[PDB]
Amino acid sequence: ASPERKAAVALRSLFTFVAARVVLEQLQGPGGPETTYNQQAYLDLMDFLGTPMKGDGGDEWMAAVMRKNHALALRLMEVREAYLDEFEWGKTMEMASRETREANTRLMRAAAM
């Protein structure tokens, strides 16, 4: 993989994961999953979070979820795609750059005499 490719796949898994956390909290809502179906969704999601998110970007994990609970998979997919519009890539890129420069500076300063 290129470094960019590696990073892309890893971002994809981060988004799937963020999506799972979001849906889990929403299913909880105030004082419990409402419908019997959402209760099922809650339990399936908790089951599936006990398993490592296989597939590039979490896709193997998503497919397994979809087989067990299609309604849940649709929601998880909707949320991770929605998260593409909210994730602050600029901030990320900014932090990665600034902190690289800052760490280099502090390391070099420290070793200098």
Partner 1 sequence: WKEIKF
Residues that bind a copy of itself (CB under 8 A): 3-12, 14-15, 18, 57, 59, 62-63, 66, 70, 73-74, 77, 80-81, 84, 87-89, 91-93, 95-97, 99-101, 103-104, 107-108, 111
Q: Is there binding between residue 20 and partner 1 (CB under 8 A)?
A: yes
16 contacts 76 by C-beta, under 8 angstroms: yes
Neighbour count for residue 8 (Cβ, 10 Å) = 13
Residue with tokens 């019997």: 36
44 contacts 38 by C-beta, under 8 angstroms: no
Q: What is the DSSP letter of 1?
A: -
Closest CB to partner 1 among residues 24, 64? 24
Selected binder of partner 1 within 9, 11, 12, 17 (CB under 8 A): 17
Q: Could you say which of a copy of itself, partner 1, none residue 71 binds, taking C-beta under 5 to 8 angstroms by partner kind?
A: none
Q: What is the DSSP letter of 14?
A: H
* Spatial distance between the Cα atoms of 87 and 91, rounded to a whole number of angstroms: 9
Site residues (vs partner 1, CB under 8 A)? 6, 13-14, 17, 20-21, 24, 46, 49-50
